[PDB]
Symmetry: D3
Subunit: 251 residues, 6 copies
């Protein structure tokens, strides 16, 4: 079925958001690893402002990733502890100014003839069963599927009763309504809902789909973390450092 | 009763967060205006890193705020359309590294002999009835009162049913549980719960109080906006520009 | 007659363009000195982005300009070699985004009831007879007068004949058509030609005036230099350093 | 005859001036395209400060220019919509401090045995008939030929008569004397007029040549734009965006 | 006798070197405190590049140094825990480019009619008996006196014998030859040895004096630390923080 | 015997210290040249923060080092005046935070089975007889050998007698005790003295060795210069420019 993952890496800026690291590696790579362990090895990167940074990275992938030896005499570069990644990574310049829907539209070409394809934000990691979501999408037959998740807390949480605060928790790990965690599974017709570069995916497209009854939610009550804040960064880095990263399911 | 407002303006950095403007004026000033219209005119500013910026501002208040004429010959500076503010503004250096509880402790001196005092974050504005909260605090007799509010949305909101997303809304204006909007009313004993500079208010102090049944919530279902993001900034600036700022209740 | 000089100091940015120095003093001050020696001592500064820089300067004029002694015990600051300037300097915030015409409009208030007033760019100096231009404007009775000047060369000048370059001169001191050197003398009705903040003076207003036959040119074949480039800067600074600044006509 | 184009890309700084883009491509590339459409495909780039930037660009030419796919498994990079450029591009480090004449001297080696060669500034584009200028140079038999052009306006243009400004135009498209538009055609003996690194081409060399009657002018009354200012940049970018770039004569 | 201290605060840059802090106060202030406790309360500051920073500081001395209350209504600023300093502080602009001797020459005016005066670097602190050095200078009758000190270690120290390193110490607290610790006591005739702005004190002037037998050394085997490196900074800050600063001899 | 040189290039930051240039080449390269002329052609670079900069350099060695021609049509890059370096250069990421001993430990793998190996700082050059030091180390049979040198002066040097400064010299070329000039020759057992990443070589390891009588000193009374200061930089660059670099012993 679906075999390609489209990732958003444009927007604000410096380097692109997905280039921010964790454990010395761009978050973008962490997400690629997530898909890859779920058998998805074809990637399309929607680049924007500072995109070349992303290009340079992949163009010098091993140099970035490992220790090397330059055998000058032979004009050869030896990679130590080389860990090959059987990926196809397409880097598409999608516009310095495009919106999320716009970027997707831009890459239509690359997924236009697939049953379904995966699409996600370049800043969120999780221990999500990618395969599961695919099968789920196939099963429900809708045009689209999103991964619903519990968000990080950004404020001081309150347990109020009778005007009395029974309990107080500073930025707790989200426990009410699930939100858009990204990790979409989509049919290529969704692109038809995108008008142009200025289209924001989370706007008309998504609302319409929900509206049309064409949008399903795969609920993921488990680990999911976006990297928006420094606190996020630190949190994520700690997890990684401590050897306790729930999204790191690979060898 | 309570007649002094303690405001947090330390932390991260550049200029201090409260110095970020809206309509050409630091948000900090907007908050001061909020209190001032509710009769609170004594202020204590907990300064940290880049604090001098805040000092310079108040030290050159009118120069910052209005058009002026320097009558050089007479060594006089004339202020056009001068709008006097009958305030007492104390600027206290509370530490480059202190935590929120730490900063409060630092300024104990200044409120230690008051029935109660006001305390708030230097980054949130609202159309809150300050007087109301005071009276409310007096009435309930607890050690502390906080203002509960509906937070801004940071993610794509979902209406799910039977795995189907009935509706999708990108970062909607918060509609479930109220959170810590700040705007506290406190008795000086709360300070006793603060151990040192590294104490984070939202931690032990607050949890304890709730825990001890010493923490009440004044619910404010209306306008409240923190300035955390640029989107926040833009939103706030628009409101201000458009002449539609709910927190601007003054003349 | 005319007794006030309106100076443009908004636009791009860092510090405001007029704040760039020559001989350790902002060019703006050099221009003020030019007017001042011609008896003009009332100034209106149209401030924009970074305007406060200008405000701080005038607010700490002597501190900026001379050596000082702080008699701490007496809370007194003594100025060495103090050189008083009997000026009235109005600093008006004219908008971060306004155009030149827009800024002028903004300050209408300040010259609205004068026979005529002076207006100029905050980046050009010259050995112009200010009084002369005033009298000239009074004499011709038109709504407006501008100072026409020979511009600095920005390219390699050519003397061609019969396809042959007879002579080549790199960025020569301008010798054909005079251009807008600024230094205007105007009647307050010109303001009526300004629609809003976005009005660029050099556009509709000026073209109309010329068009209406309401615009005269006081030709200044002598010294006039704008500070646009670094080369300009260096040139100007050299002149100043060498004690050969044609615009420095004061004591 | 002449088959190599020498381009100046040193001087001030950040990235080199010629690296500034238009339509996402360095202006330098636009100029190369100009020559290339006129059959000139051998280039010599006089690099200076930040030169490596230029080197990296050419070294990763397609990566910079197009969308790519990294077939990781095969260690292959696939270029989408590849547009080959049959050029030879020599990058010579000509000194961080050298002057224009100095840089040329530096590259003598590369054109020393040619009938004639082309030389130009890395910041100006035009719809110039390169071939035409070559033939013209061959025809006149002089040591040197330059392209004369109408410059952009930097000031407010005036139509004065009898002290009256008949018309006013803000920075009009130049209509008097033609200037040095660059785009030279030269015989290698001109190098003999260059003494060292500090030689500025537009100085002694050029003046001498004119002086010696060895300098001809190919007048180009048409499109020619240098990129000196941001206004220039914007103007150029607009033209390009609008699909109305007179210098873009290629497919 | 000597009653004025001349301090060097020009050179490299950002803020001036002497403005770098320790315990939240510019090192410059620490040195002033050193003199002040030894009865020296008249200061002359040789300012250079970024000098205004120094000016602003003294101009807003208490605002910088303490907590304040702005009694807006009364246009009054109240200083908390005010600690008056009965100093006279002259700030002289001595040139962005001048050398140390040059700066001194610049301020001749200010000490020209004193028996002797003090002169020092704005970056070194110590527990030196200032009075002692004065008396010493008076006693020896030479034109000049310098304070000799043991310098901080910048390298790995070695105890070698017979090619064997008996002991190794990383950047130890200096134990061989004393160096120029500054803290000079001078007669005004030394100025005659200074030719111009480009004169470096430590060059001709000092060598000559030694040479002429006009230079004495007051040896200070105790505490003396220059702030050149960050390590220096950290070291100094630690000392200060720990309440173990040997130079802090005041109340 | 010893055939590999381990070089420290981590620490503070921007680019890595060893990347700072002299004569347009990173100092690191100068040191490599020093070893290389002494027959040492196997290198191990201990990288830290900004390490990739070092990686990119070696990965694009000739592009950095020489003039090139890109034969686009053939996808070939031609190097002019190519000067091959028969080196093996290993780049190991040794930690953003590691200490000098820590970094060495990190690379143990690479020298663990050698009789001895060379180790040095990436910021010091000299006309040292590398071979000599090796033979010397072999001869003395100790675990370690260091190169002792005379350091640059950082202060004003004094010749005192009887309280009188007989002579004064500003930052003279060091003439008392030799210091740690680096350029070590070591047996791999020294690594056993390194506990972790936080180990500073110059601490426990070195002191112990000296202490244990396992540390010898090869005294180099000749040319040795570290690049710590800008003055250092300038000095070194001058030497290089003037064609008088004592460390440049190669062709
Ligand atoms: N014009 C833009 C903006 C963003 N992005 C990319 O999209 C990803 C996410 O962007 P973001 O973090 O700024 O977006 P968000 O504000 O966090 O919100 C998005 O991500 C949230 C989950 O983290 C969703 O709940 C929300 O609905 C969705 O809009 C990033 O990798 C970014 O590079 C992009 O390609 N183009
Ligand atoms: N060490 C620190 C950190 C912050 N602040 C000040 O405190 C205010 C708020 O700081 P922030 O925006 O970083 O804090 P927050 O993450 O937004 O969270 C705070 O504000 C939220 C409401 O906006 C609350 O719900 C939450 O419980 C409370 O911790 C700012 O004016 C800041 O200058 C301070 O004085 N010292
Ligand atoms: N929005 C803007 C732009 C500029 N300025 C002020 O106007 C002065 C001149 O601005 P500029 O140097 O950018 O303007 P220009 O491009 O040099 O052109 C102006 O000045 C030229 C003479 O120097 C005139 O010939 C020309 O007609 C007139 O438009 C500066 O002090 C600047 O601060 C301003 O207040 N607001
Ligand atoms: N030391 C220098 C200075 C400049 N350049 C290069 O030369 C080109 C033009 O430099 P520029 O824009 O600073 O020069 P200009 O002031 O615009 O003037 C030049 O270009 C003008 C046309 O644009 C000519 O009329 C003029 O005679 C000629 O000197 C740029 O690509 C620049 O990188 C260089 O290699 N080395
Ligand atoms: N052109 C210059 C350079 C420096 N300074 C001032 O002089 C002081 C010392 O300058 P520095 O630290 O750069 O000087 P140094 O290299 O440390 O050397 C000086 O200070 C050393 C003691 O710290 C002396 O031993 C040495 O002889 C003397 O030259 C600083 O406060 C600096 O602002 C100045 O006014 N003008
Ligand atoms: N954590 C650190 C610090 C430094 N370095 C590297 O080590 C070299 C030297 O570092 P530095 O100049 O900061 O060290 P130092 O303060 O100059 O001192 C070192 O070098 C001195 C000789 O220059 C020795 O006398 C001294 O004992 C030794 O510690 C540089 O190439 C640097 O990149 C490193 O890999 N990791
Ligand atoms: Mg996000
Ligand atoms: Mg906040
Ligand atoms: Mg101008
Ligand atoms: Mg140009
Ligand atoms: Mg020093
Ligand atoms: Mg070093």
């Amino acid at each position: 079925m679906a075999s390609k993952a489209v990732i958003l890496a444009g927007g604000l800026g410096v380097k692109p958001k997905p280039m921010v690291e964790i454990g010395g590696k761009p978050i973008l790579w962490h997400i690629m690893k997530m898909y890859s362990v779920h058998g998805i090895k074809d990637f399309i990167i929607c680049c924007g402002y500072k995109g070349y940074v992303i290009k340079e990275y992949f163009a010098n992938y091993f140099l970035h990733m490992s220790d090397v030896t330059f055998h000058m005499a032979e004009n050869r570069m030896e990679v130590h502890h080389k860990r090959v990644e059987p990926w196809n990574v397409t880097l598409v310049d999608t516009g310095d100014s495009s919106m999320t829907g716009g970027r997707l539209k831009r890459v239509a070409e690359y997924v236009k003839d697939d049953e379904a394809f995966l699409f996600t934000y370049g800043d969120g990691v999780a221990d999500l069963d990618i395969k599961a979501t695919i099968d789920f999408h196939k099963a429900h037959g809708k045009k689209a599927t999103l991964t619903a998740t519990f968000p990080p807390g950004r404020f001081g949480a309150l347990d109020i009763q009778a005007g009395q605060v029974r309990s107080f928790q500073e930025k707790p790990k989200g426990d009410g309504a699930m939100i858009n965690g990204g990790f979409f599974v989509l049919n290529p017709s969704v692109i038809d809902l995108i008008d142009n570069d200025a289209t924001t995916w989370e706007q008309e497209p998504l609302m319409t789909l929900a509206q049309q009854g064409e949008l399903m939610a795969f609920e993921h009550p488990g680990f999911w973390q976006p990297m928006d804040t420094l606190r996020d960064k630190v949190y994520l880095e700690g997890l990684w450092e401590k050897g306790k990263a729930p999204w790191k399911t690979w060898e």
